[PDB]
Design a protein around this nucleic acid. Structure first.
Lengths: 138, 212, 179, 189, 52
RNA sequence: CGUCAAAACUUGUGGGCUCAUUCUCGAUACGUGAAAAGGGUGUUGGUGGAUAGGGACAGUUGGACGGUGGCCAUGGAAGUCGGCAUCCGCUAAGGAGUGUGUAACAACUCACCAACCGAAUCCACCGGCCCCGAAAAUGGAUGACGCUUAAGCCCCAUGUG
């Protein structure tokens, strides 16, 4: 929903991601800087790898680059360090001390304030997304 | 071509089955008369369809096998293994006679005269009569259209006239389906194997019930 | 219509003379049959089947011709069973409005003959009834049901030669279609 | 036999029509256009002398019922030519090989195809009139127009058939001179 | 390319029919039962094979 | 009982179906190519369902949006090569999305409905007559002609009214 252009790929882990999307210093609107520059280098210290096909959001008045809720991606976005990904071919993954965030966390947490009913939508929704990362940790 | 089944449209002769008298018996292919679940309590398929013969006909094994396998195929392929139990409801057995002349004891022409020409085992067929459910298939209602489609290959694996009827009868079992359910409800219906048993008004010695 | 083809007889009959049936119990139809010879045959015949009883054992009291209302059209519904096509009994429901039920039975039979190809034995005409509502079902009867139904129509006959004057030698005068 | 019956005609307004015989003689702005119909006679009845004409049947057969429409429409279209005429636009279309069409007037000359082979020529029948127009970015363009679509069209369809090709694949074939707008001469009254 | 529009027009010409099997018939989109008598308007109709 | 060929060229008094670019619609019992399968929106008449005027059916018209990827495989599909998916809101309705495919986004589409719409229509069955199916050697034979508001096929009647 609310769709927008192909940003394609991250291309560099530092500042100025994408093949040529963020290479212009100032865009055709004169939109100002804050969330586009070193902030997306700063972002890389919290997340790396996988399909970072991105999305670009022009909603306020400072340039803003933010990642899609992409699948595999928004899951591995929970990790705190890099074990070294080793390139995405056939939807790769690796351990990083963070799992079990579905049925006891988001499902319960978002139960009173979500799309649809308490136990039909939300709880059921979240589960599948990391169903086989289950392990009963405290 | 093959001593073809077309040609054997008549009967003429007696019934010719297996007999002691028979010792020339050949053996067709055609094997598994019951397909789908063979321990389908009748409840399993509520539903019953018959693939009937229209009449009076004679039928080769070749055809028979062919439809069978076809039947299963489309069916299962579309619909699952048990979603019916497709049952060849016909066993057929009648034994065919061959000439297949000229057994090489002389020159050529007027080889035989007739010389106890008299038929060799040729094949099996039923020389069929009385609109026999050929295969009967018992389903679940949902799976009816799937049931039908196989029959569309299946008919084709015969020649001749075979018709497709659904019965009020439950799946190889008995009575208008609503009354059957009702029959269980009214208790007048009793389960055996896949196959099932129905209660007599003559009333015998004694199933008794409660209570101690 | 009324080319009154077919006849209508009511047959009233009884089972066993025998006191083995002390007291037989009696049968009626009004039946369209073209004569009574048939009529009684038919009568008997369902009796020989439907009722399993041989005629030669039992007894028809009466077979008597049965008359229509009057002078005008009443809307008939017709119900049919035909056995043929080497595939037995089959049903049909058809619709005629006329002044005579007889003409309706009649007309059915040709109609079937022409129209479903059929032959007469092989039919058992179940029933004919005057239809009361403004329906009257069928589109063709309804079609010509209209108050103020009226028409145009043209282009046909009268016998061109004839003995009521006059064969080959014609025309003395000149041509078009004529009307 | 089951009554259709036969008869004559439906109508609109500002254009005169025959109302008699097998033949409709339609007269309006652009002249008069008239056609004679064969077995096409059918339940007429005039509803106004000048103002209402219909032919929408009482009984008959299945096949009959279709015709009735087909009949109106066509004569309606007799009215159409007589009122607003027909204008067909065609454009020559070609890519590998350039293609040229002129108009003699009395006849249409078609050049170039595939380097040109034969010269396609169509004599301009009556009132299909032909213009090669080109300014206004009128473009590889022929224009056929006159007050009989059927003729304007027939001649037209004929043209599409005049630009046929055979041997060595439609998956590389396209080029030819195709219909680009079949219309009226204009909107008119 | 004689012009895109033309290609579109053309495609209509170049590709757009389904076919009666039996008589191979070049048939419509909306075709059901062929136009050749001797084919009895037969109903296996196949799509034109896409070009390559 | 058309004409060849005796007898209604059946009408007063009569009914349907059937139209057949076939070497060609068909047409006397017996009879014997009865083409077969197997088909055909040819026509012709059922049966079962319907939806149906609180609106059905066609045709239109407007919209097919929003809470929201609810989604996962996934090089790359946020609805959309692929695969497990899926609820709320707004409503007349609109799919956690019918297709089309920018590798993917997009876009393109309508399934979903209102509005129009204004009457039958819609589905499945049905089986009837009718046609395709339907190729060999001398010119060619429903007897011949021909017949088709029959002279076919089928029907009845020679009949008031």
């Amino acid at each position: 929903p609310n769709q927008e252009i192909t940003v394609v790929v991250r291309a560099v882990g530092g500042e100025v991601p994408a093949t040529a999307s963020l290479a212009p210093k100032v865009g055709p609107l004169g939109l100002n800087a804050k969330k586009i520059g070193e902030d997306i280098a700063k972002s890389t210290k919290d997340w790396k790898g996988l399909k970072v096909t991105c999305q670009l959001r022009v909603k306020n008045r400072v340039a803003t680059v933010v990642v899609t809720p992409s699948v595999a991606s928004r899951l591995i976005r929970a990790l705190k360090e890099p074990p070294r990904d080793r390139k995405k071919v056939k939807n790769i993954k690796h351990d990083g001390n963070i799992a079990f965030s579905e049925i006891l966390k988001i499902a319960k947490e978002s139960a009173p304030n979500s799309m649809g009913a308490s136990m039909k939508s939300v709880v059921m929704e979240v589960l599948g997304t990391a169903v086989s990362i289950g392990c009963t940790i405290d | 071509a093959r001593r073809p089944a077309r040609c054997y449209r008549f009967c003429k002769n007696k019934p010719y089955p297996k007999s002691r008298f028979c010792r020339g018996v050949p053996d067709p292919r055609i094997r598994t008369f019951d397909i789908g679940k063979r321990r389908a309590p009748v409840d399993e398929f509520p539903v019953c369809v018959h693939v009937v013969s229209r009449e009076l006909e004679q039928i080769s094994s070749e055809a028979l096998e062919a439809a069978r396998i076809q039947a299963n195929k489309y069916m299962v392929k579309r619909a699952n293994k048990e979603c019916f139990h497709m049952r060849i409801r016909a066993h057929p057995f009648h034994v065919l006679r061959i000439n297949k002349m000229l057994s090489c004891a002389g020159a050529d022409r007027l080889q035989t005269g007739m010389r106890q020409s008299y038929g060799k085992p040729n094949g099996t067929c039923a020389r069929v009569r009385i609109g026999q459910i050929l295969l009967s298939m018992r389903t679940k209602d949902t799976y009816v259209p799937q049931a039908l489609e196989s029959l569309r290959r299946a008919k084709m694996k015969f020649p001749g006239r075979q018709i497709i009827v659904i019965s009020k009868y439950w799946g190889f079992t008995n009575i208008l389906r609503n009354e059957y359910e009702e029959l269980r409800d009214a208790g007048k219906l009793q389960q055996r194997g896949l196959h099932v048993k129905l209660i007599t008004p003559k009333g015998k010695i004694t199933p008794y019930n409660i209570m101690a | 219509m009324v080319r009154p083809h077919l006849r209508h007889y009511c047959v009233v009959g009884r089972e066993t003379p025998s006191e083995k049936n002390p007291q037989p119990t009696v049968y009626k139809f009004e039946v369209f049959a073209p004569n009574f010879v048939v009529a009684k045959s038919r009568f008997w015949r369902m009796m020989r089947e439907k009722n399993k009883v041989k005629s030669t054992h039992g007894d028809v009291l009466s077979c008597k011709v049965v008359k229509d209302r009057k002078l005008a059209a009443r809307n008939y519904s017709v119900d049919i069973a035909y056995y043929s096509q080497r595939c037995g009994y089959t049903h049909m429901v058809k619709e005629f409005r006329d002044v005579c039920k007889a003409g309706a039975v009649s007309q059915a039979y040709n109609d079937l003959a022409s129209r479903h190809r059929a032959r007469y034995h092989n039919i058992e005409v179940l029933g004919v009834k005057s239809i009361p509502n403004h329906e009257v079902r069928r589109l063709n009867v309804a079609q010509f049901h209209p108050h103020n139904l009226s028409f145009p129509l043209l282009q046909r006959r009268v016998k061109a030669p004839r003995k009521d004057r006059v064969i080959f030698v014609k025309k003395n005068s000149k041509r078009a279609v004529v009307a | 036999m089951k009554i259709k019956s036969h008869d004559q005609i439906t109508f609109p307004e500002d254009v005169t029509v025959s109302v008699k015989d097998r033949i409709v003689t339609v007269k309006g702005k652009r002249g008069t256009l008239t056609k004679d119909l064969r077995h096409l006679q059918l339940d007429f009845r005039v509803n106004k002398k000048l103002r209402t004409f219909t032919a929408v049947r009482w009984f008959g057969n299945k096949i009959n019922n279709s015709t009735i429409n087909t009949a109106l429409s066509h004569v309606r279209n007799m009215i159409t030519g007589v009122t607003k005429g027909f204008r067909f636009k065609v454009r020559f279309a070609y890519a590998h090989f350039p293609i040229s069409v002129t108009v003699e007037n009395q006849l249409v000359e078609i050049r170039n195809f595939l380097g040109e082979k034969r010269v396609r020529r169509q004599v301009v029948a009556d009132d299909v009139k032909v213009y090669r127009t080109d300014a206004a970015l009128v473009k590889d363009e022929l224009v056929l127009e006159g007050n009989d679509l059927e003729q304007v069209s027939r001649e037209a369809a004929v043209m599409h058939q005049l630009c046929l090709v055979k041997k060595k694949d439609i998956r590389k074939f396209l080029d030819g001179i195709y219909v680009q707008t079949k219309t009226n001469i204009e909107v008119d009254e | 390319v004689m012009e895109p529009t033309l290609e579109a027009l053309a495609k209509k010409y170049n590709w757009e029919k389904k076919v009666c099997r039996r008589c191979y018939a070049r048939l419509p989109v909306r075709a059901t039962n062929c136009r050749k008598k001797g084919c009895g308007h037969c109903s296996n109709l196949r799509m034109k094979k896409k070009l390559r």
